[PDB]
Design a binder for these strands. Structure first.
Ligand SMILES: [Ca+2]
Ligand SMILES: [Ca+2]
Ligand SMILES: [Zn+2]
Ligand SMILES: [Zn+2]
Lengths: 548, 344, 547, 345
DNA sequence: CACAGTGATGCAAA
DNA sequence: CACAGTGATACAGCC
DNA sequence: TTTGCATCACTGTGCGCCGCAGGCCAGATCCAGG
DNA sequence: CCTGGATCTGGCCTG
DNA sequence: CCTGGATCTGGCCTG
DNA sequence: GGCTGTATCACTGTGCGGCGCAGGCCAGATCCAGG
C-alpha cells in the first residue's frame, strides 16, 4: 500500500505517462492481488495540492490591477485579447499561471526546506520575520515546434517559454541577513518552474508584448508589497526581489529598446562603440539600466534639443525603442562560452592558413583550411564536425590538447607560442564566469582576472592584428571588460545563466510528445501542468527517501 | 473598377494591418510599420511608390525640429489644408494606446526626395482618453476650423482593469470632441441622438457637417445601419453641435473611403458580419443638405480575395485603393500578404 | 512479491529505462519495507532466457556454410570484413543475430501461442508434424540518425534496419493445411522483430552487399532444410518460407538489379514501358522474378547475340545489374497511398488553375494555385499544409468532403462531375489493397475491381488528357493493373505492407536515445537487444493478465 | 616531381579506391566505377581527360561484339602488345570475386571518340581461383608470349567458410601460373623460393623476367622487404620457371608503378606500416641482369596528404600519377575525395 | 482499412 | 565550472 | 464513496540538403547634375 | 548555308 | 571632365 | 555462498535558421564545328 503522493512522485519523476502508469498499476494489481499503487483519480486528487490556486494568501497592501481571488490556476495567456475580425489578427495559443499564485505555490512547496534551513542555521522555528525571496526569471524562444492539424488559429511553428526559479531566501535576524535557503543546482531542469507557454515568434514584437504585458504588470505590482502566508500553522511575511538574467543577448536587445547586434553600440552594459572597444579593451564600467533606457527613449521620441538623426542617435546611444521588460545587466555564461569557442574556431582556421603572412585568400582556400581542421580534430580530439557550435563542443575544444593538435598543422613556432599563450589566458579567465561561487572555489583566478584580461587584450592587439584591428566581438568585450564588476555586484556569473532554461526546453519537447493531449486547444495546459508538477520539491523528496 | 495585383520589393514585412497612407503634393507616403523603426529607416515614414505594378518603399527623413513618433497601429488620420495631416490615438508596438496629436507636414522638397516635419501638439481641456479605431475630421464654419472627434475603442480604466483581463477593450463614450488646432483646446459634448459606442466607422466631411455612417459596437455586438449628420456651427461665442439621425445607413465596419470626384465618395471593403465579408461597394454623393448612397457595380474580385477571411488597407488619394490579403500561411518567408490595387 | 520475468515485462513494455526502474524499485523498497519489484541483476538473469543463443536446436540436413553451435547471440555484422589500410575502406558499425538462432528464439517465445492455436483447432498437443512457418522480411534505410563523438570509424548519419515478422504457422493434418497461428496485428510494432542494425546509406551498394550477404547466405541455406525443436517437452519439426514484401519501390529497384524510378520501364512486376502503360493501363500480367532477373543479367553480361547497347537493353528490359536478394513481386500499400495522394494533390492544383483550357503557365501562378489550395484545405478540411506527404494526410485527403471542399474553388461543374467520379472510383478501389482480408471484409468491393479500374483508366484518359497522355506514374499502373493477381496469389496486400517497419523505425529512434548506452561501440548491441525484448510475446502476455 | 591538384566535374562520386586507368594511343581511360553502371554510361568505361587541371569523365561505348563487364574493384591489369589490356580477378559490386579474363582493345577510333572491344577468354587447365590484389605480366622468350600470374587475396574455400566469418580473406597459395593468351591454358608451378603469400605488390616486366617486390602477407601480418626475380624460359617443350631471391627489396604495399623512361621505373606511394605512410619514392632502373633501387628526391607533399591516413590511385602512363585523398571529413557532398596529379619529368 | 498512446471527463458498476 | 541519465561490469558489503 | 472503462480529436514512423535569418555598416558601383 | 551530332537544362518517377 | 551623392553587395555580430 | 548496492566508463541532449531536395532518367532546346 503506497500513498497517492508517493505514486504521483514515482509517476512524474520516472517520466511515466498516465497511459503507462495505468498499465503498470493494472498488472501489479491483477497479478499480486492486493493493490500496491493507487488508481489515476487518486493521483489526480493528490496533485491539486501542488498546483497553484489552492492555498490562501494575502498581499499587504493589495496589489494594483490584480484580483485578490486566490483560487486562480491555469488561465488564458491572451488575457482577454479581442480576436474580432476588425482588429489586429491573432494566431497564438497561450496558457499561464498567475504570478502571485505561482509564487505562493513555490513557497508552499519549499516550506519543508525553509523550516529545515531555519533549524540548521541556529535559528528559531516560529520566526515570522520579513523573508526576502530572490528569484531568477528566464525567457527563450524555441524553433521547430511543429504545429498540429485540426481546427484552430494559423499558429506559427515556434514557441516562447517564460520561467522562474527561486534562488535564495534570507531573513532579517538582528542586523545580519542569514540565508535559510540556497539552490544547490541552480542551472538544473529540476528547479526551473514554468510560468507561461505561448506559441509565437520571439521576433514578433506585437504578439510578444501583448502576451507578456500582464506578467510585467503583476511583477511590477508585487515589486513593492508584502505577502503574508501561513507556513506550518504560523503566518509569515515575504518580500520579493526579481532578477531577470536568463536571457540571451538578442532578446535583451529586443526588449530593452536597443539596436541589433550588428550595430556600432555593442554592449548592453555600457555606452561604448565597436571602434573604441578594440582600442581600450578592458577599461569600461557598467552604465546602462532600465530607467536610463526609458529616459533615452523619451529623449529620442520628444527630440528636445532639435537635432538630426545622427546627432540624436549619438545623444541617446542607440536607444531608439521603448523598453517593456526590466532586465539585469549581466552576461549569459552559456552563450558567452559558445561565442568565445566559435571565435577561437575561426582563429584556428585562420592561423593554419597563414593569413598573417598572406592577407588575401580565395574562398576555396578557406574551405580547405576548414576541411583540414575538421579532419585533424576528428583524428586527434574525437570531435565530429558540426555547423552549429554546441556547449559540449565548446567544453571539449577549449583545451590545451586541442591547441597541440592544431599546432601540429602550423609550420611556424611563434604562431605556436601565440596560440599557446592565448589558450592559457582563456583557461585562466574561464573558471570565474562558470563557477557558482568564485570567491570560494577559485579566488586566485578571480584575483588575477584584470591582469590576465590586459595580457589577453595586448596579445589580441599585437599577435592577431590581422583580425582585431578596429573590430571585436561583443562577447570578447563582455568577457574582458565587465566581469569583475558583475562579480562584485552579484557574487556569481553562471549561477544566473540561462542553462536551466535550456534544460527546461529539453523537457518541453518530451512533455509535448509523451505527456500531453495531442490537441491544438489542449496541449499547452497539459504541458504547463506537467512541467509545473515535475519541478515540485515536495515530490522530489520521496525519490530521495533511501538516503534518509 | 480595375483590380490589379502589386509586387512588393525587399521589405514586404513592414506592411501590417493598420497602416495609414498620407498624400502630399500627389505623392503617397507610408506610416505605421511593423515593429520599431530599424536603422535602415529610423523615422518609420516611407515613400509609397507604385509604378508599373511594383512597390518600392524608400526611406523619408525628418527635419531637425521634428519629433520622432512611434509607429501607431490604428490612428485617426485627417487632412487639414499649409497642407498637413493630423493623427491621434493608435497603438504603440508595446500595445499601449497614445493620446498625442502629431502634425505631419512637408518641411522641404528636393528632386524626388521629401523631408517631413512632425510636431507634437499639446491638448488641454476636456481631452479624450487614449483610444484607437476612431475618426477625426476638420469642418469649416464662418471662416474658422475645428476638429471633430468621435469615439472609438479603449482599455478599461485604471480602477477597473485586472491583469486576468488586461487586453480586454471596451467602446468609448459617445461624446463628440471639438479640437481646435490653433490653441490645442478640446471641449466635449453629450448629444442625446448618440447612445451606442462606435468603432471602425466611416466619416465624410462636408463644409460644416460630418457624416458618420457604419461602425461596430462592443456592448450589443452588432453592426448598426445608422447614419448621423453632426452639424457644427461656429459663432463668436460657444459652438453649437447638433446631431441628426437619417435613414439610408449601411451596416459597415472597417471600410475604406476614397474621394474620386468632388462631392462624390466611394465606400470600398469592410465587414458586414463576422464570418461574412462585404464584397459590394457604395457610392456616396454629397450635396448641400441631402446625401444618397447608391449601388455601383461589383469589381472583379479574384479567387483568393473571395475566399479570404480578412482584408485591410487604406486610401492612396487618387481615387485608388491599396488593399491587402493574408498570404500562403505565413511560414518562414515567401510573402505573408497578397497586395492589390483597385482603381475608380 | 513479483517474479523477475514480470518485473522485466513491466520495465520493458512501459518504456522504462534501467535507471528509472532502479529509482522506482529503490523508493518502493525504501518506503514499503518489502521487496515488491526485483533488482536489476535478477532482470538481467531472467533476460538471457528470451534472447537468442539459449535453446538447443538441430537441423536436418545441417545447413551449408553455417555453424553448428547453438549459443550464438549478438555477433559482429561486418562478418570479419577486413579493415586494414590496403583494401576497400569500412565506415559502419553493425551488429546482428544469426538467422537460425533468431528464428529458433522467435519460435520459442510463442510456444503457448502455438499450443493454444493447435488446441483451438481440435488437434492434439503432442503432434510433431511438419510445421510450415511463413515469415515477412522487411528492410528500410533511415535518415537523420545523428553521429556521435568519439573513437571509431567515419560513420554516415544514416541507418539501415533488417527485420522479420512471423505471420502464420501451419500444420499438415490429413490432406489439407490447417493453420495454427495467425498474426492479428501484422503492421504493428509489437510483432516486427529486429535482425540486423547497421549505419550506412541504402544507396551505397558495396557496403550494403557486404553487410547483407551473410544474412542472405543463411537464408538461402535455411530455404531447403528442416529444423527440430523441443517444444512442450515433445520435439517438433519446422520448415520455413521467406517472403520479402517489406520493401519500397526504390530499394526493390536497387537490390533486384533493375533500373531507377524515372526509367522507361516502370513496373517491377512486368515488362511494360511507360508509353504502353499510358495506353493500356489495365491489361498486364506479372512476369518478373528473381531467377528471370539473374538470367537477364547473364544475358546482359555475356552478350550472346552480338547486339548494340540499345537492342541489348530492349532484349534484357533494363536488368543491367546483378540481383542479390530474392524478393517477391508485391506492392507496398503505404507508399501506394502516399504516392496516389500526392498525385491527387497535383490533380487538384492543376484543376484549380484550369490547365485543361490554358496549357501554358508561369511558375508564379502555379505557386498561387498551390497557395489557394493550401488556404482552402486549412479552412475547410482543417489540414495543415505539409511539405512531404505522409499517410495521415493521405487518409484525410482521400475523402468526398475534400473534393466537395475543392469544388468550391473551380468554376465549371463538368470538372465537379469529373473530380467527384474520380474520387468515388478511388474510394471504391482503395479498401481492396488496404484491408487485411478482402475476400471476407469486402468481397463485393473486390469482385468488381476490374470494372472500376477500367472506368478509372478511361476517366484519366478522357477527362484528364492534359496530364496523362503519354505519361503515367508508377503507382497508378501498379494500382490499376496488378492487384487482382496479387490478391489471388496471396490473399492480402495491406498485411504484407511495410508500416510495421516504419513503426519499428519510430521505436529505433526512441530506443537509440532512451534505452541504450551513448557510445559508438555500444549503441547497436543495446538497441538490438532492447528491441528484441520489446517484441517478445512472452512478456507481452504478462500485460494482458486482466482476462 | 611537380604535384598539382585536379578539379573534377559533375561525377566526382564514380572514382572509388581501386579504380584502374588504361592507356590507348596516348589517351587515358577509366574503369572500375562505384556502383553498377548507370543509364548515362551503361558500359562503365570512361574517357579520363585531364587538361588545364580539370577532369571530365566522358562515356565510351563498346562494339557490337563486346561483353559488358562488371566494374571490378581490384583486378590485375597488364598491357599486351594489336595493343590491348588483360584484366583478371577483382571484386564485383556485390562483393563476389571473379575468375574471368577480359581483353580490352580499341575496335574503331573516330575524331576524339573511341569504341572499345571487350572479349571474355575461356581459361582451362590449372586455373587460378577467384582473387584480388594480385598481379599479372607478359614475358617474351624466344618469340613467344606468356602471362605470369602471382598470388593475391581470396576468401575461404567452400568447405571452410562460415557465415559468421563470411567476409574474412586469406592469402592465396604462392604458386605461379603461366597463362597462354593464344589458347587459354594455364599451368601452375610450385617454387621453393616462395613460401609466404603476397598481396598488393609491384611487378616489373623485363623481356623474360618478372621482378616482384614489396607486398603484404596475412599470416604473419608484416610487409617483407623481399625481392624475387621470376625467370621464364620458353623452349619447344615445357617451360622452365626459376625464382631467385635478391637483396635490395623494400617494405612496400599498395604502391603505384610508372615507366618514365625506357628501362627506368618509379615507385610512388604505398604503406610501410599500418598507421605509418610511405612518403618516399624509389627509382628502379632495369638492366640486362642487374637491377638497383635508389633514392629520388621527395616531392612537395601538401598539408592534407601528409596528414591523411589512406590514399589510392594508379598510373596514367605518361610518367604521371593520379592519386587521391579522402575528402576533408565529407559532409555527404561537395567532393568526397581530393585528387592530385604528380608528374615525373 | 496502423496502431498504441494522450489525459480529462462522464457514467456505469462495485 | 550543467546535469540527470545510459547500461554493462566489477567489486565490496552483507545475510 | 471508490474503481473501471469508453470517448474525444489528434500524435508519430513513414525522404532530402546546407549553413542560414535578421540586422547593421562600410566599401564598390553607378547614374546623372553641381 | 546548312546540319549532325555533343551537351546543358529542366521536368518527372521514387523516396 | 569631373564628382556628389543614391544604392547594391558582401562581410560580420547575435541566435 | 549468494544476494544486493554503488562506483566507473565516455558519451547524450537542450542550447539557431531555412526550403523543397537527392538520385536518376529522358526528352527537348542549344550550340559548335565539318561538308
Ligand atoms: Ca532558443
Ligand atoms: Ca526510410
Ligand atoms: Zn561594455
Ligand atoms: Zn505492370
Amino acid at each position: 500500500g503506497l500513498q497517492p503522493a508517493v505514486c504521483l512522485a514515482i509517476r512524474v519523476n520516472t517520466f511515466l505517462s498516465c497511459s503507462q502508469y495505468h498499465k503498470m498499476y493494472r498488472t501489479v494489481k491483477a497479478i499480486t492481488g492486493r493493490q500496491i499503487f493507487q488508481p489515476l483519480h487518486a493521483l489526480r486528487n493528490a496533485e491539486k495540492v501542488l498546483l497553484p490556486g489552492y492555498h490562501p494568501f494575502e498581499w499587504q497592501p493589495p496589489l494594483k490591477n490584480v484580483s485578490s481571488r486566490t483560487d486562480v490556476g491555469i488561465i488564458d495567456g491572451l488575457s482577454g485579447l479581442a480576436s474580432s475580425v476588425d482588429e489586429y489578427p491573432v494566431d497564438t495559443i497561450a496558457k499561464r499561471f498567475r504570478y502571485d499564485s505561482a509564487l505562493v505555490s513555490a513557497l508552499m512547496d519549499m516550506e519543508e526546506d525553509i523550516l529545515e534551513g531555519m533549524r540548521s542555521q541556529d535559528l528559531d522555528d516560529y520566526l515570522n520575520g520579513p523573508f526576502t525571496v530572490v528569484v531568477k526569471e528566464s525567457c527563450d524562444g524555441m524553433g521547430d515546434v511543429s504545429e498540429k492539424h485540426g481546427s484552430g488559429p494559423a499558429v506559427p511553428e515556434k514557441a516562447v517559454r517564460f520561467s522562474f526559479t527561486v534562488m535564495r531566501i534570507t531573513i532579517e535576524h538582528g542586523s545580519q541577513n542569514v540565508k535559510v535557503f540556497e539552490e544547490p543546482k541552480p542551472n538544473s531542469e529540476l528547479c526551473c518552474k514554468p510560468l507561461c507557454l505561448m506559441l509565437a515568434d520571439e521576433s514578433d514584437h506585437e504578439t510578444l508584448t501583448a502576451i507578456l504585458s500582464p506578467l510585467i504588470a503583476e511583477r511590477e505590482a508585487m515589486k513593492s508589497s508584502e505577502l503574508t502566508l501561513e507556513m506550518g500553522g504560523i503566518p509569515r511575511t515575504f518580500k520579493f526581489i526579481f532578477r531577470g538574467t536568463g536571457y540571451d543577448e538578442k532578446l535583451v536587445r529586443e526588449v530593452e529598446g536597443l539596436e541589433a547586434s550588428g550595430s556600432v553600440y555593442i554592449c548592453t552594459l555600457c555606452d561604448t562603440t565597436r571602434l573604441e572597444a578594440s582600442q581600450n579593451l578592458v577599461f569600461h564600467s557598467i552604465t546602462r539600466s532600465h530607467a536610463e533606457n526609458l529616459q533615452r527613449y523619451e529623449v529620442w521620441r520628444s527630440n528636445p534639443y532639435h537635432e538630426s538623426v545622427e546627432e540624436l542617435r549619438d545623444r541617446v546611444k542607440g536607444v531608439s525603442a521603448k523598453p517593456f521588460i526590466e532586465t539585469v545587466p549581466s552576461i549569459d555564461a552559456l552563450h558567452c562560452d559558445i561565442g568565445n569557442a566559435a571565435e577561437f574556431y575561426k582563429i584556428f582556421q585562420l592561423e593554419i592558413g597563414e593569413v598573417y603572412k598572406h592577407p588575401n585568400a580565395s574562398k576555396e582556400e578557406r574551405k580547405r583550411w576548414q576541411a583540414t581542421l575538421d579532419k585533424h580534430l576528428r583524428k586527434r580530439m574525437n570531435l565530429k564536425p558540426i555547423m552549429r557550435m554546441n556547449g559540449n563542443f565548446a567544453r571539449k575544444l577549449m583545451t590545451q590538447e586541442t591547441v597541440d593538435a592544431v599546432c601540429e598543422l602550423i609550420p611556424s613556432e611563434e604562431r605556436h607560442e601565440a596560440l599557446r599563450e592565448l589558450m592559457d589566458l582563456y583557461l585562466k579567465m574561464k573558471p570565474v564566469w562558470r563557477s557558482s561561487c568564485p570567491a570560494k572555489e577559485c579566488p586566485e583566478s578571480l584575483c588575477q582576472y584584470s591582469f590576465n584580461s590586459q595580457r589577453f587584450a595586448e596579445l589580441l592587439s599585437t599577435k592577431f592584428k590581422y583580425r582585431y584591428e578596429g573590430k571585436i566581438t561583443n562577447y570578447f568585450h563582455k568577457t574582458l571588460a565587465h566581469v569583475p564588476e558583475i562579480i562584485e555586484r552579484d557574487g556569481s556569473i553562471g549561477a544566473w545563466a540561462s542553462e536551466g532554461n535550456q534544460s527546461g526546453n529539453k523537457l518541453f519537447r518530451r512533455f509535448r510528445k509523451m505527456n500531453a493531449r495531442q490537441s491544438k486547444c489542449y496541449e499547452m495546459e497539459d504541458v504547463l501542468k506537467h512541467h509545473w508538477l515535475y519541478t515540485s520539491k515536495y515530490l522530489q523528496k520521496f525519490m530521495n527517501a533511501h538516503n534518509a | 473598377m480595375s483590380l490589379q495585383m502589386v509586387t512588393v520589393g525587399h521589405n514586404i514585412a513592414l506592411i501590417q494591418p493598420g497602416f495609414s497612407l498620407m498624400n502630399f503634393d500627389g505623392q503617397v507616403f507610408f506610416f505605421g510599420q511593423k515593429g520599431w523603426p530599424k536603422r535602415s529607416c529610423p523615422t518609420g515614414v516611407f515613400h509609397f511608390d507604385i509604378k508599373q505594378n511594383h512597390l518600392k518603399l524608400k526611406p523619408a527623413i525628418f527635419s531637425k525640429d521634428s519629433c520622432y513618433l512611434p509607429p501607431l497601429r490604428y490612428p485617426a488620420t485627417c487632412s487639414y489644408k499649409k497642407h498637413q495631416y493630423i493623427i491621434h490615438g493608435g497603438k504603440t508596438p508595446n500595445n499601449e494606446l497614445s493620446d498625442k496629436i502629431y502634425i505631419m507636414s512637408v518641411a522641404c522638397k528636393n528632386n524626388k526626395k521629401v523631408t517631413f516635419r512632425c510636431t507634437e501638439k499639446d491638448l488641454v481641456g476636456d481631452v479624450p482618453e487614449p483610444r484607437y479605431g476612431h475618426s477625426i475630421d476638420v469642418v469649416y464654419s464662418r471662416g474658422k476650423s475645428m476638429g471633430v472627434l468621435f469615439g472609438g475603442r479603449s482599455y478599461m480604466p485604471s480602477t477597473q482593469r485586472t491583469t486576468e483581463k488586461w487586453n480586454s477593450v471596451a467602446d468609448c463614450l459617445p461624446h463628440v470632441f471639438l479640437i481646435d488646432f490653433e490653441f490645442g483646446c478640446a471641449t466635449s459634448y453629450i448629444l442625446p441622438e448618440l447612445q451606442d459606442g462606435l468603432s471602425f466607422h466611416v466619416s465624410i466631411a462636408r463644409n460644416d457637417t460630418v457624416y458618420i455612417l457604419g461602425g461596430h459596437s462592443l456592448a450589443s455586438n452588432i453592426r448598426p445601419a445608422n447614419l448621423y449628420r453632426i452639424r457644427v456651427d461656429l459663432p463668436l461665442g460657444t459652438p453649437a453641435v447638433n446631431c441628426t439621425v437619417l435613414p439610408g445607413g449601411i451596416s459597415v465596419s472597417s471600410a475604406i473611403l476614397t474621394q474620386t470626384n468632388n462631392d462624390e465618395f466611394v465606400i470600398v471593403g469592410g465587414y458586414q458580419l463576422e464570418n461574412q465579408k462585404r464584397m459590394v461597394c457604395s457610392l456616396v454623393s454629397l450635396g448641400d443638405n441631402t446625401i444618397e448612397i447608391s449601388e455601383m457595380e461589383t469589381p472583379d474580385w479574384t479567387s483568393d480575395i473571395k475566399h479570404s477571411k480578412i482584408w485591410f488597407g487604406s486610401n492612396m488619394g487618387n481615387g485608388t485603393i491599396f488593399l491587402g490579403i493574408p498570404g500562403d500561411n505565413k511560414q518562414a518567408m515567401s510573402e505573408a500578404f497578397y497586395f492589390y490595387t483597385l482603381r475608380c
